[PDB]
Symmetry: C7
Subunit: 188 residues, 7 copies
């Protein structure tokens, strides 16, 4: 059950579920496993907010264990393409594609709360075909892995060699260690 | 009146006001007819303004995709296509079939023209799609792709047998989109 | 199913996309035919006739066919109501779906270029859908003949031609369907 | 279910005094039909009501609830068969107001009552043999009364699980007119 | 699908609730009983003087749920008329017979069975076992209620409730289970 | 908002009249909804009585205790009315209405007995241990003794038996004040 | 479940009972803690802060606990927002539920007389909820110590006392929870 609120607008009073009410504040929630359904809803929200004001910052709250790589890339490309800066805030956790999106927020505007944790490692499951008739072949997996490593090296400032070595490890960084690595700019 | 993110009500319906359609997930008759309905609605509301279809789809049923294809070509407005995430099979065919000059891909999206057997089989219990009809449809799909990409029929027929994804830049070079939005 | 919001005297209102097009006298006949969807189409035809008995109605058809008596409920309602019912095949029309396509108002039956049409009627459409109903062999043969007569009447083909061709479970292209008399025009 | 503006399509047609009896007959759909009939009577006890019937039949006492309500309310209840009417569906069709029972040209009508409609639908209810024979006779009497056939004829013919065409249903007295 | 009417929008049952009509339909259990109790209390508060009608088409069901309806019918100020359409069995039959004196009705092809099967008495919850002596107490209580409202003697009810046979509308009227067959 | 019996429902309309329905098994979900209605009613008017209609087989002890503590804490008097039955936690809450304002209808039944099932962990990772069960059983007995006027030894003996009391016997025992 | 409808000059507006209480700045933390309910609680906190950053917020807590990182999302949001967040235990609070109860604004943490509090954290709360995530032994130990430090800070107990007492999977009464520093007052 998602609670509702009633807010005054220029057009009169209107009812909102809590997430649509926070969308009016240019806040978007990326929560749970990443897949096409939820990634396309986030793409839709980013496009809508850009249409509403292309200059004002947008915030994505991230609490996600990661998930499907191409779904996460659709969010990534949309974040980069729209005119507004997209600020990222990790609460709870960001892993795999969740961590990649966190680290890809606008420079200076990536944040983690004190007890959140960040894991860059990309499990095989995120790369496999999600539809019954799609088999994702080894070379394409290797291309995607290098692509993700290059994106991380670029946004963190780490070298490519460093990202590719560290992404093999299946462990979490604390918010402070994630800030030190360049995955976020500030622990709030 | 009331607004939600997930079902000027839900986010998708608000963007439909902006002449934007989302083609997402597997293509089957249910979602293809919703897209046909959105296309016919937008043409009736304004037969002059462009329409955009965002495509993130692993493909699916061939006749359902052909329903979308025929509607796109038939209505008066130019239909622009944008690949986000991926486009495979019928999804790649539809991406390639947007209005000339108005087909786009985002930099990390991927495109695969290959059409698996599963798209051609009968979806209803009492329908059996026979081998000659499969070959006829595969050829028609190849000719549609040859026409919109500028590749020869022979090149399409050879390359569609491989089930590999192209990058967005490679898909532009192949003629499946006109521009990578970067 | 997306929504379309319009403002009015007393606030604003919301239609789903299908309801919005029903305002424009378009009906969607999509998916397998059964009693549930057939009665909804009958309800829409009756509503549009009562709203304006003079203006045409369009049914878009994308269907593999299905239950014969449910399709017959739609057929009789199309014939009975006052407005001309135009039909447009998008995707495919098989079995009862093809019969209803062919039964649109004369001159107003259409197919899109990549549409396909199959008149063949599989056994499954004729069998009992209810637990306590067993549809017997002679009734199947009788209904198969009634369907062939409807097709002969609307296509202009001989009953002998329809009976021969309906035994083959093969599709016609839009162009071949138009030449056969199943539609009047490829759009 | 499409909408018209704000009614769903069936509610919009209920405003025009049309009720849809569709699908298998059971207590749930019967009681919705009874409610609609009572509502329409209260709204206007003079104007005719129409019931569109497309149904394979079903539970006998649920059908009898509809039958008794059609007979009891003041408005004439016209019936129209679209698609098919079997078992209690056929009984209800034949029980519309005299002169106002219709069938469309390709509809079909079967008066036969399978054993399934008489059995207990609740777990703790067993419908016994003599009650079945009483109900079968009551249904036959209702059909003889509304069709004009003799009781003997109905009792013989109802044993066959065959459909009548719309024309043969009119000839038998199950409807007054085939509509074209 | 439950149709709607516009007058605001009402589903068909809420529209008829405005006309002080309640539908008791299907098997009786706590869920549906408490909804009927709420409708009775709502109608009493809206107008404690005007009659209420309950239409009953029910195979019966859980005894204590039915007793919740019975007690509420007796307690509220309005007369509660009952009308049997289709059938009334077990607790449904009891509730039909318990409408206000002179205002209990059956339609001509309605049927009524007072018999109470064992299933209505057993515990519906996981941790409740309804014991034999409590079943016997409740069976006697139901028989006393029927005797009071029908005018039959207690042992006449006890004899006839043992048989799981239906009464026609005419025979239910003759027995005192309703006052009138509406023709 | 549209109106139904089952948008604006019948229970919501009655909440406007300060009536709350406690119906069915007691668990966290329904108990938290009752706490919410109690807090809402107290904020709307802290002086007017509230009524809880109780028809319940009982259920989870800590869920019932959430309702109990909220009834005692809020300012309004909470009247309780048993319809159908009240067992276990349902009987405890009935017995805990405002003094003088606890009621039973003539055919309702009340069983104070607390089955083991109400005390066990409801979450997968919670094991409720034996000494905590004994502590809770004693607390519930103390609550019943206080509200009924019976001795603790009387409650402790009687709660062992999984038998129902009639409305008249519940009133005589002090579980309600009046049979209506 | 239930609705509250309020009349206005432009007709009627409707809430469910929880949304109506949200209007009074009360949030309900009920049932097992997981990402779904935790993100709903985070959103409610951020909304109430944006609506009025000065006024207190109350969380009613009736929970057997649950997923540790979901509860940590709520914890961090409670500490970050400007308003004081009061906590009230009704029923019970265990594991993450007990931690969040203890984490309300100093002096504004309450328990009702028959509620019970269990700080113990079962293994199940630390394990991966996602199919592709295995939460490893060293991360579990790190999270366990962090929870003990959070509890020590808010209760006033030493780290050693928390670490010893959290191993036992027993409940504290409301009065014992108050004496331990887990709430400030039994209401
Ligand atoms: Cl306003
Ligand atoms: Cl093939
Ligand atoms: Cl046969
Ligand atoms: Cl028989
Ligand atoms: Cl028998
Ligand atoms: Cl007979
Ligand atoms: Cl017994
Ligand atoms: Cl490990």
């Amino acid at each position: 059950l998602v609670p509702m609120v009633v807010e005054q607008t220029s057009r009169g009073e209107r009812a909102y579920d809590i997430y649509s009410r926070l969308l009016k504040e240019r806040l978007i929630f990326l929560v749970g496993p990443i897949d096409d359904h939820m990634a396309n809803v986030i793409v839709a929200q980013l496009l809508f907010l850009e249409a509403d004001n292309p200059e004002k910052d947008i915030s994505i709250y991230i609490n996600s264990p990661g998930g499907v790589v191409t779904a996460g890339m659709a969010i990534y490309d949309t974040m980069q393409y729209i005119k507004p800066d997209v600020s990222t805030i990790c609460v709870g956790q960001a892993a795999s594609m969740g961590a990649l999106l966190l680290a890809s927020g606008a420079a200076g505007k990536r944040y983690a709360l004190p007890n959140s944790r960040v894991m860059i490692h990309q499990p095989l499951g995120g790369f496999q075909g999600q539809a019954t008739d799609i088999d994702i072949h080894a070379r394409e997996i290797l291309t995607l892995r290098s692509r993700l490593n290059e994106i991380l090296a670029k946004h963190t400032g780490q070298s490519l060699e460093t990202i590719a070595r560290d992404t093999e490890r299946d462990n979490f960084k604390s918010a402070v260690d994630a800030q030190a690595y360049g995955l976020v700019d500030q622990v709030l």
